Amino acid sequence: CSAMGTAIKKRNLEVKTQMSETIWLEPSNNKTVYLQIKNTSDKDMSGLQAKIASAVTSKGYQVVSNPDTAGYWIQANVLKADKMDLRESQGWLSRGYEGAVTGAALGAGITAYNSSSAGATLGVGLAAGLVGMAADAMVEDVNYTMITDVQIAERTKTQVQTDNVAVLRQGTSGTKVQTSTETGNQHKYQTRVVSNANKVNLKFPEAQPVLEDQLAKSIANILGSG
Amino acid sequence: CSAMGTAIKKRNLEVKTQMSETIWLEPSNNKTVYLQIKNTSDKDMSGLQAKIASAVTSKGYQVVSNPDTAGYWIQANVLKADKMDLRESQGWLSRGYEGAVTGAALGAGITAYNSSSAGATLGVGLAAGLVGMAADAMVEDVNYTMITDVQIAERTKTQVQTDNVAVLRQGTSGTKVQTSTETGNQHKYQTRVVSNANKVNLKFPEAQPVLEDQLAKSIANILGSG
Amino acid sequence: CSAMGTAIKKRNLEVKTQMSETIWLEPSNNKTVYLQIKNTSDKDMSGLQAKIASAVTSKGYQVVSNPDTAGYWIQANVLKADKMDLRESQGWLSRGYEGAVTGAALGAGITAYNSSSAGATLGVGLAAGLVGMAADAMVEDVNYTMITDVQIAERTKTQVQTDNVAVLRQGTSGTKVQTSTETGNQHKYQTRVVSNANKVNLKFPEAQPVLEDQLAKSIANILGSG
Amino acid sequence: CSAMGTAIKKRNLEVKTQMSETIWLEPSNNKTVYLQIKNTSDKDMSGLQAKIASAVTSKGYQVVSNPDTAGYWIQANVLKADKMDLRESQGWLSRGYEGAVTGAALGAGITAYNSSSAGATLGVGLAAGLVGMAADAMVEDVNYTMITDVQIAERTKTQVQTDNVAVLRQGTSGTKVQTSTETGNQHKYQTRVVSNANKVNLKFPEAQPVLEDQLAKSIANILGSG
Amino acid sequence: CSAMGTAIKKRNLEVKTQMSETIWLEPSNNKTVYLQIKNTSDKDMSGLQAKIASAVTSKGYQVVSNPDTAGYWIQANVLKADKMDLRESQGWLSRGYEGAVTGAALGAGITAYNSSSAGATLGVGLAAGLVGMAADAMVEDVNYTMITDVQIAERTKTQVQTDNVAVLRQGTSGTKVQTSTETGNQHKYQTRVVSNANKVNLKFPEAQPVLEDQLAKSIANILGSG
Amino acid sequence: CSAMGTAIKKRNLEVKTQMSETIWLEPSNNKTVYLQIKNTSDKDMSGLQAKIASAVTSKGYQVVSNPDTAGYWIQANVLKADKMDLRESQGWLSRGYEGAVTGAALGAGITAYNSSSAGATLGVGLAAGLVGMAADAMVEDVNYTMITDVQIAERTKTQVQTDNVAVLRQGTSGTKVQTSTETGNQHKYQTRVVSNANKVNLKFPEAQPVLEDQLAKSIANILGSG
Amino acid sequence: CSAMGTAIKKRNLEVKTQMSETIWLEPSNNKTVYLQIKNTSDKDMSGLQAKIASAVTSKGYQVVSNPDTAGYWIQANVLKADKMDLRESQGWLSRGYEGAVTGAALGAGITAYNSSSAGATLGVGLAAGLVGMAADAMVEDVNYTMITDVQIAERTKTQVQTDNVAVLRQGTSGTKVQTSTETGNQHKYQTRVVSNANKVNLKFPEAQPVLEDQLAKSIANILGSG
Amino acid sequence: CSAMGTAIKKRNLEVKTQMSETIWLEPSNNKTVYLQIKNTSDKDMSGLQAKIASAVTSKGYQVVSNPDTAGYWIQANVLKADKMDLRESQGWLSRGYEGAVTGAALGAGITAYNSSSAGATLGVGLAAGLVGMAADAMVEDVNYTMITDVQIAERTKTQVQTDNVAVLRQGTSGTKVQTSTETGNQHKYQTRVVSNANKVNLKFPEAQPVLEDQLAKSIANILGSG
Amino acid sequence: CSAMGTAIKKRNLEVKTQMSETIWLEPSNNKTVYLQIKNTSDKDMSGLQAKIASAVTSKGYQVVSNPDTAGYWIQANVLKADKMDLRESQGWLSRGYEGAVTGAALGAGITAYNSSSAGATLGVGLAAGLVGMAADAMVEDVNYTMITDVQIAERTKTQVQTDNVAVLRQGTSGTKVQTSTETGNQHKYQTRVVSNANKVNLKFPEAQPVLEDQLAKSIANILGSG
């Protein structure tokens, strides 16, 4: 059974968290960190801010509420979240066909037993095939993919020139190009973290705590155990 | 049955809302937001503007009606909406063929019963096959895809130069290139939100409230819980 | 039956209207709109101008007949219209083959009845197969695709320079390049609206009113509920 | 029968006329139009100029014979015309094979009747198969595709510089590049109109009147109902 | 029979003539035309010059023999001509296989008749199969494709600079680049005309008159009915 | 039989001659032509010079032996000649397989005749199959493809600058770039002529006269009937 | 059995560690190394820092805690870690199908033994097939792929100019370009190390010690046995 | 038999010689030619230089041994020579399989004759199959391809500047770029000649004389019959 | 047998030696050559240097040991050598499968002989199949491909500027670009020679003498028979 094979394979929650690329930070004596965590996804990660703060404080850093007097900024946005069924990557044999067959066959388990009436065996076989198809189709091999954008700002003594260049699309024909220049002492680096939570019939509120834990640990480990 | 498998799989409304990319906003003391929400799609989202206003006010911001004295602009356009049937991605076994066969076979359930007249059984089998094909073809696995364009304007102290460059197509041969330059204190950033509402025999007015709720929450969360 | 499945699936008129991209307009106090609606398609949309005017007036704008003293221009052209049959995307099984077979088989419904004469049954079976093929081939699953070009002109205080650049093809060898420069206070943005009207045996005059209604609502909603 | 299915499907003349791109014209008080219509195709469209003149005059414009004092020029060229059979897109089953089989089988309709002589039945079956193949092959599902080039010249007050640049090919090795510059007050825009006339066994003189009517209406509607 | 299907389908001569692109000519009072028609093809079009002259004179123009005092030049070259059999696009079933089988079978039409001697029937069947293969292979579905290059020179008042740039290949390694500059009052535009003559067992001398007629009409119509 | 089909199809010599592109020559009063014909191919075309001279003289030109005082140069090089079997484009069924089978079967034409001895029939069948394979493989469907390079030099009054640029390859690593500049009054244009001679078991000396005739006529017709 | 084949093939832990490219270091007398090891992966490598320190000290270098007075910097980041099952590269035959069949067949090992009751044999066969499918699906051929980024900084006497160029993405439309310039005496080179740990039913904590050992040896060997 | 078909097809030596591109030489009064013929191929062409000298002298030129006072240089290098079997383009049926089968079958030609002993017939059949496979595999359809580089130097009065540019590869990382400039009165042109010698079981010393003859004739004909 | 077919086909050593491109050398009076032959391949060519010296001396040149006073340099490096089996290009039928079958069948040659005991025949058949598979797999159709780099330096009177440009890769991130300029009177040209030695069960020491002979002859023939 494909459904039972999936239910056996992915029987326990499996969470993966992969940073896209490395952000290199010079050794520094800064201890203050300012956190700005946002969530533009349909899923709920409300404890991610507190978990990032706790992980950062575990490394000796101090979380401050004043962005101007903070050596580091951790700007994170839980940008996206998608849910997919991996079984559908197999096309057919995933809509309950084999689940209906296994159960249409089991309906013949009444012919060799008490009642072998043709109408009765047909009815029981049909009901068993329907129940088998329902059980096969109700096995959801769900994978939640989350995409988080991270932007670390480190305060330096070097004058950094920011050149904002926005190309705003304007109706299939034009663009409005906005350009501006600012000067400040802050190097900003970006990165992306991709999280995955896989399980059979997985409901997101079960995967949310571990997802937040791993994401917070990764984002805090960007700073390293200073 | 493929139709019944679909009706079981997608039996409850499933709404997804995914922002395209992250708009980074500096920590600010601005509290005023001006909303400009438009809808150039055939579907109806009349409550989206009010839901965005409520979500923004929940974060401590204040929605104002004067665009000139607003620290933030949320300009949103529900640009597009499409409806498709996902079953049609399977080609055949989606036009009622298998639903006709399941029912043409069930018409033989009269031969082994009261009347086994050849004309009667043929007629009942044909009617049952027609009804099965109709029921299979009437199972619509509908997916509504919505595209919303968001444009956030943040008022700054930096002089921003906007260079409008429109390349208007002119009859398969030419272009009229319009260029202009303006100066103002407003950085404009764009982004795109893709919404999906999936269900069996889904009617849009059922999916509209949750679609608006999720879209409003995402667009407001762009500003973050300031 | 493929024909019957199509007639069941697309039994009621389905109209879609999708704008290509968003035209962003700054908040403004302009209330005057000038409409220029043209139709270079073989289909007839004569009521589109009045419907656009009514939809625009519903938003508080005022439609004027003087292009020079109009804050906004709505220039629309119903550029193209095509009609196709979607069943032909399936290649064969859509020219009446299966509709002929279903009916050639039904011609055997005379052998088991009053007259089983070989000539008579052959003739009735042939006539029934011909009628079945005709009925299958007469089921038209028609989709009208309409392309409209929209050009919104908004009057500004910024000097706008228009550089007309036309590359006129000249006989497989040359081009005449026409260049000119104009100055005026009007930003012109473009966009495209794609309409679809789908039904079984759909005749365009039935789809035209709703097509115009949706197109007018979309084009007027470009301006937003000002 | 594929031939019969085609004869049923495309039983009445179907004419389509699609402009390639939109030519945008500013609102103007010009009322004079000069028409220059040419036909470098093997087909005959002699009434096209008169139909364009009538359609233009219906919009309030006035057709003049002096190109120098005309606000608008409508320069049209019926460049190309091709005729194809769409059945040949199916490869085989379109050269009379199935039409021969349907008729070779019908030749057996003499064995069960008056004369069942082996020579006689063979001869009648062969003749019937030949006639069936001839009738199937004589069913022409013809599509006429016509390509028209349109060049609208609008007289302006802006000085327009035309830079003629012709790259004349010279024997697989060279090019003669002719360049010249002229100055005049006329913006020239181009566009293309594609016409299709589809029917079974369609003869062009039947499709020519409606083809001209639709083409003239489209080209005149370029000017819009001024 | 594929051969019979071809002989029925393309039973009468079909001539097509398609100009590549449009050459736009300004309205002019010139009436003199100078013709220079050449033929570097293996086929013969000797009457093309006279037919072009007649068609041009029918439009009111006057054909002159002095190139210097001619308002228009019509320079045409019948560059290429190819002959192909379209049946060979089907690969096999076009070399006489099926024509041999149809006739090998007909050789059995002697067993059921006067002499059924094994040697006699084998010999007659072999001869009939050979004759059938010969007749099938002797059915030529011929298509003549002709390519003509046209170069129209129109005398203007604008000074036209011709920059001859020839890149003469020199033995797999080098090029001799010849460059020169001339000045004259003549705009030269090019174009290409593709002619097709299709028929079963078509001999070119039958297709030549109509081919010349259509080509001359097209090239003359480049000038338009001035 | 594939061999018989080929021998019937291509039973008479078929010669094609196609110029690559058109060389445009201005109307001129020059009457002197200088011919330089070379042949770097393995085939023999010794009469091509005389045939070109005769064709040129037929047009009123005069062939001269002094290159300096010749208005026109016809420089031709019969660069390449290849011979191929077209039957081998079919892969198998062209090495004698079917020719062996047709003849292995004909060896059974001795069993039903005078001697039906197993050894005798086996020997005769083997010999007949060998002879059939030999006859099939000895059917050569030969196509000679010839490539000629033509270079026409026309004497003008315009100063022509020739920039010789040769990039001589030097051992997989280097190039010696030779550059030089000359000035002379002669425009040189190139072109290519592709000839084909097709027949069954064609020997080149049979195709050479007509090949030369067609090539000479084409190259001379480059000049046109002046 | 595919599961048995996997369990036999990959029965013992196999660890691979491959550096991407070579970092060339000049011969030097520096003996001080500063280590900065971070881990932004979900896996745990806490002993990697100590192992790198031990391996470096084995080569004669001295690990220091002051980054400013260190001749060498070893900056390493265990960026990513993924876990996959290689059996799934075979598609089917890996979800327990063949493991179910091997065991459904073994359930017939009760018919030829003590109890051959149809119900009993069916039940035992079903249970054995379920157990076989479970055992097949419980065989995990796991491969852990770890990606580490290494950045070696070597202190020189040459002035090194660092030009920070960050292109921060801003919402699908814009980029903020940050540019800065610093000067210092430190050449920084990068590289990447890819580690793999393969085994059947491998749990990461078993592979972690050897993974750390190999990674530390490789990163330390970058410095060479100085 | 494929082997016998090949031995029949390519039974006599077939030599082809094709120049790559044309080297155009101006008409000249030079009569002195200097030959430099080299052979860096494994094959032997020792008589090529003498054959080129004889062919050149046949055209009226005079071969000289002083390169400085020679109007023309013919520099030729027989660069490459490869030998291949064309039968191997058919994959199998070319290693002796079918030749083994034809002979394994012929071993049954002893059962119906004097000795039908099972051991004897098996042994004779095996020996015959081995001999047939050996004979089939010993049929070599060999094609020798030769590549010759030709460099013609023509002495002129124009100053020719040679810019030697050699990019010498240096160990997967670098290049040494050598550049030099010389001035001399000699235009050098290149070209390539491809020779083919095809036959069954062809040994090169048989094809060498004709190969040299054709190559010499082509290279000498570059100069033309001056 | 595939193995026997290979052993028959490639029964004698076949050596090919192909130079990549031609190095053109001007006629010169230099007679001194300096040889620098290196071998960075795993194979042994120790006699190549002496063979090159002998071949060069055979042409009249004199081999010198002083690089500074040598008109020519022959710098050669036997860069690479690979050994492959061509039979593996056929995938299966080359690992002994067919060789096992031919021999498993021959094991049945004991049933029809003295002992037909089932155990005895099974054992003898298994042993014969094993021996056949071993003999098939022990037939090695080996091809040695050798790559030699040649660099000819010719001393000139022209000043040659060498621009060394080395781009040394530095750890997946950087490059050290080394540039230098030298001046000397020596043109250096490169080329590549590819050698192949093919035979069944070929051992390199048997192919080495002929490989060296051919390579030396080719490299010496670069200089030509001066």
Author numbering:
A (entry chain A), B (entry chain B), C (entry chain C), D (entry chain D), E (entry chain E), F (entry chain F), ...: 36 to 261
Sentences reproduced from the published study:
To gain insights into the molecular mechanism of SFX, we purified recombinant TraTpKpQIL from E. coli OM vesicles in CYMAL-6 and determined the cryo-EM structure. Analysis of the purified TraTpKpQIL by mass spectrometry confirmed that the first cysteine of the mature protein (C36) is modified by DAG and PA, which agrees with previous reports. The map displays 10-fold symmetry corresponding to ten copies of TraTpKpQIL. Each protomer associates with one DAG molecule, where interactions occur exclusively between DAG and its own protomer. The arrangement between the β-sandwich domains, including the β5 and β6 intertwining, results in the formation of a cyclic architecture that consists of an inner β-barrel with a diameter of 48 Å. The conjugation frequency of pKpQIL into recipients expressing TraTpKpQIL was reduced by a log-fold, −3.6, compared to the baseline level of conjugation, −2.5, in the absence of TraTpKpQIL.
Following transfer of IncF-like plasmids, recipients become refractory to a second wave of conjugation with the same plasmid via entry (TraS) and surface (TraT) exclusion mechanisms. SFX, which is mediated by the OMP TraT, is specific for Gram-negative bacteria. TraT is a highly expressed ~24 kDa lipoprotein with a copy number of approximately 29,000–84,000 copies/cell. This revealed that lipidated TraT oligomerises into a decameric champagne cork-like structure, composing of a transmembrane α-helical barrel domain and an extracellular ring domain.
